[PDB]
């Protein structure tokens, strides 16, 4: 009676914990955490930039933050929802290689209209480079493959397609690794 409208239902918590890579306490603290600030549970694009800023506070242009929100919103409604943030955040921790790879392509292309161009690849690389600049937690001295893709992909797009398409990206990513090596840090080889 009234209290039922507090905290998320336990049935979904159990099924959500089945897949989360995080513990139930971390999910409830996050849910109750921003829920108090926004009882609706729906965060605007700026809200997503704020939490992203916490993960990457050494950033500045924030262009990378809004860019993610632009292609990180499943409903593209201009706002991140509680189910999308908690579920998407869990995928960000370490979802299936296929799920994490999908998030990589969405971010790799700002308008991800199915075709990727080098200007978009360089623009996104600079976006994550500035966010990963300073020392928030950049990989090794500079694993971020910027010039590496310029030559590596330039070699793969010689076919003369005129553009870069997921057909070569996804097939090359599963055929010739390094093409999608995310600059993210890997917990281990297992
Ligand atoms: Ca949404
Ligand atoms: Ca595009
Ligand atoms: Ca091509």
From Swiss-Prot:
Signal peptide: none annotated. The keyword Lipoprotein applies. Ca(2+) 3 binds at residues 157, 159, 161, 163, 168. Residues 24-59, 60-95, 96-131, 144-179 form the EF-hand domain. A lipid is attached at residue 2 (N-myristoyl glycine). Changing residue 165 to A: Reduces calcium binding. Abolishes calcium binding. Belongs to the recoverin family. CDD domains: EFh (cd00051). This is Neuronal calcium sensor 1. Pfam families: EF-hand_1, EF-hand_7. GO terms for biological process: regulation of neuron projection development; regulation of signal transduction. Ca(2+) 2 binds at residues 109, 111, 113, 115, 120. GO terms for cellular component: axon; cytoplasm; cytosol; dendrite; Golgi apparatus; intracellular membrane-bounded organelle; perinuclear region of cytoplasm; plasma membrane. Keywords: Calcium, Cell membrane, Cytoplasm, Golgi apparatus, Lipoprotein, Membrane, Metal-binding, Myristate, Pharmaceutical, Repeat, Synapse. It comes from Homo sapiens. It comes from the Eukaryota. Ca(2+) 1 binds at residues 73, 75, 77, 79, 81, 84. The gene is NCS1. InterPro entries: EF-hand-dom_pair, EF_Hand_1_Ca_BS, EF_hand_dom, Recoverin. Binds 3 calcium ions via the second, third and fourth EF-hand. It is a peripheral membrane protein; Lipid-anchor. It is found in: Golgi apparatus; Postsynaptic density; Cytoplasm, Perinuclear region; Cytoplasm. GO terms for molecular function: calcium ion binding; calcium sensitive guanylate cyclase activator activity; voltage-gated calcium channel activity. Residues 174-190 are annotated as: Interaction with IL1RAPL1. Transmembrane segments: none annotated. Neuronal calcium sensor, regulator of G protein-coupled receptor phosphorylation in a calcium dependent manner. Directly regulates GRK1 (RHOK), but not GRK2 to GRK5. Can substitute for calmodulin. Stimulates PI4KB kinase activity. Involved in long-term synaptic plasticity through its interaction with PICK1. May also play a role in neuron differentiation through inhibition of the activity of N-type voltage-gated calcium channel. Monomer. Interacts with KCND2. Interacts in a calcium-independent manner with PI4KB. This binding competes with CALN2/CABP7 binding to PI4KB. Interacts in a calcium-dependent manner with PICK1 (via AH domain). Interacts with ARF1, ARF3, ARF5 and ARF6. Interacts with IL1RAPL1. Interacts with RIC8A; interaction is favored in the absence of Ca(2+) and myristoylation of NCS1 is not required.
């Amino acid at each position: 009676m009234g209290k039922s409208n507090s905290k998320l239902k336990p049935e979904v918590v159990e099924e959500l914990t089945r897949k989360t890579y995080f513990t139930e306490k971390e999910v409830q603290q996050w849910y109750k955490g921003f829920i108090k600030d926004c009882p609706s549970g729906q965060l605007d694009a700026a809200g997503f930039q704020k939490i992203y800023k916490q993960f990457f506070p050494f950033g500045d242009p924030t262009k990378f933050a809004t860019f993610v929100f632009n292609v990180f919103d499943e409903n593209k409604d201009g706002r991140i929802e509680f189910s999308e943030f908690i579920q998407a955040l869990s995928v960000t921790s370490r979802g299936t290689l296929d799920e994490k790879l999908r998030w990589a392509f969405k971010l790799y292309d700002l308008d991800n209209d199915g075709y990727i161009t080098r200007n978009e690849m360089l623009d996104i690389v600079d976006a994550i480079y500035q966010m990963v600049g300073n020392t928030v937690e950049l990989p090794e001295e500079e694993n971020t493959p910027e010039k590496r893709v310029d030559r590596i992909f330039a070699m793969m797009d010689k076919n003369a397609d005129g553009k870069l398409t997921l057909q070569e990206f996804q097939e090359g990513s599963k055929a010739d690794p390094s093409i999608v090596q995310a600059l993210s840090l890997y917990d281990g080889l297992v």
